[PDB]
Write a protein that binds this ligand. Structure first.
Ligand SMILES: O=S(=O)([C@@H]1C[C@@H]2O[C@H]1C(c1ccc(O)cc1)=C2c1ccc(O)cc1)N(CC(F)(F)F)c1ccc(OCCN2CCCCC2)cc1
Ligand SMILES: O=S(=O)([C@@H]1C[C@@H]2O[C@H]1C(c1ccc(O)cc1)=C2c1ccc(O)cc1)N(CC(F)(F)F)c1ccc(OCCN2CCCCC2)cc1
Ligand SMILES: [Cl-]
Lengths: 220, 235
């Protein structure tokens, strides 16, 4: 694959260029807050974000090398985790609040608390945008990989490239070899907590995009 | 803003560019006149939020009062949406790319009565930009001119501050002209070619205003209010 020959810098450049825009909530600010339904607003936002997520996924190196079926499977497994890491990233510089959108910024519940905790953890780590995009791409490629042979092999190789990229970013930033491996581990372990939150979030919803919806979106 | 170089002006404008939004996903097809109009309204309204963010980053714009910023936006918003539309559609002959998932040929334009006429005008503008090889750096200059120009001749005056406001706007406009010329000189165009291409691009602006006026006459037959615009700017 062409993707496997990308350097660290090229991988970061591709990922930064692929980033979705930050969307706004769809509601008239001239109106009182009480008119709105929180769940309604969040659903409308998420649905609009999903279209952009598909476009983003198609630009993650290696992703289009996969079958349409496997692309859908990865997206089905990752979509809420991807929405959540986006949320936490946007909320980093807003302690005690979740920036669902620039016009939908909420203070303090169980999952909300978990997301806030993740956000504060990213803030304490001084998580950089270049690291963020690597991590969100890992979520895409990893979350569904163990629930599907050449397809899996390819995915694992792209994942290894992403690891290389994360280390490269850290070496470039001035971190010692010991600091690099420690920060690599810290970042990746936070992914287990993102999985946790996603599963808890799913259990709350039960709005969820179907295999078929995702397939149609990818085809279109 | 008046201390920016041409290159800095271009950089600021490129960095300010809004995202390309999507239409309401999976609408009923075929469209009715009502459903198409509904989709276009929904799109436009979402684009407007991002336009405000963009406007606030156009050098010189925030130097104006909130009132004057709203006045400019009131006069320019549809023209700005339309030059965006024509720019997005350049590489799609015979079609208008309202959004990546809403790409319509003239046949589909006929779905709303009287619309095909303006659809044709927009297609014509888009082909004109394509034939001229309009550059992204030129596009952002032009869209910024629309913002600052369209409402400039319909402010009140009388007051010293108001005369200074208009003067400032005109100075920013002159800087944008300088920037356009700079881009052309940098590209290797002769002085005569530069002045000709400048005039061609600005004359196309009169046609964009025309199409905007025709488009506005349909919307009034949806339009963001002074209050909505002011709130968006404040937020
Ligand atoms: O965990 S949730 O259930 C779920 C995650 C988050 O909130 C919901 C949601 C969503 C996603 C898709 C959708 O269709 C609707 C909502 C989220 C989302 C949307 C867009 C995005 O960019 C990022 C996240 N949840 C947690 C809380 F907010 F409280 F912290 C929650 C629970 C009860 C509510 O009443 C409200 C929300
Ligand atoms: O180009 S438009 O002028 C403008 C484009 C699109 O439609 C408008 C619009 C919009 C904006 C806000 C909104 O809320 C709804 C729609 C558009 C927009 C939205 C987002 C965006 O990024 C770009 C554009 N246009 C479409 C085109 F002809 F070109 F195809 C158009 C032209 C003629 C019409 O009728 C004439 C006949 N009529 C006259 C009066 C009596 C009854 C008969 C009708 C529409
Ligand atoms: Cl949007």
């Amino acid at each position: 694959s062409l993707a496997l020959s990308l350097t660290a810098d090229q991988m970061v450049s591709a990922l930064l260029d692929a980033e979705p825009p930050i969307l706004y909530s769809e509601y008239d600010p001239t109106r009182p807050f009480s008119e709105a339904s929180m769940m309604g607003l969040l659903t409308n936002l998420a649905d609009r974000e999903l279209v952009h997520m598909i476009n983003w996924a198609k630009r993650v190196p290696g992703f289009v090398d996969l079958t349409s079926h496997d692309q859908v499977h990865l997206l089905e497994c990752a979509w809420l985790e991807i929405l959540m890491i986006g949320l936490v990233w946007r909320s980093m510089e807003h302690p005690g609040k979740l920036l669902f959108a620039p016009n939908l910024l909420l203070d303090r519940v169980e999952i909300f608390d978990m997301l806030l905790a993740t956000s504060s953890r990213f803030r304490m780590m001084n998580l950089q945008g270049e690291e963020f995009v690597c991590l969100k791409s890992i979520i895409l490629l990893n979350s569904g990989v163990y629930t599907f042979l050449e397809e899996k092999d390819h995915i694992h190789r792209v994942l290894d490239k992403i690891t290389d990229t994360l280390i490269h970013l850290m070496a470039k930033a001035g971190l010692t070899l010991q600091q690099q491996h420690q920060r690599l581990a810290q970042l990746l372990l936070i992914l287990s907590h993102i999985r946790h939150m996603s599963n808890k979030g799913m259990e709350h919803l039960y709005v969820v995009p179907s295999y078929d919806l995702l397939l149609e979106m990818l085809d279109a």
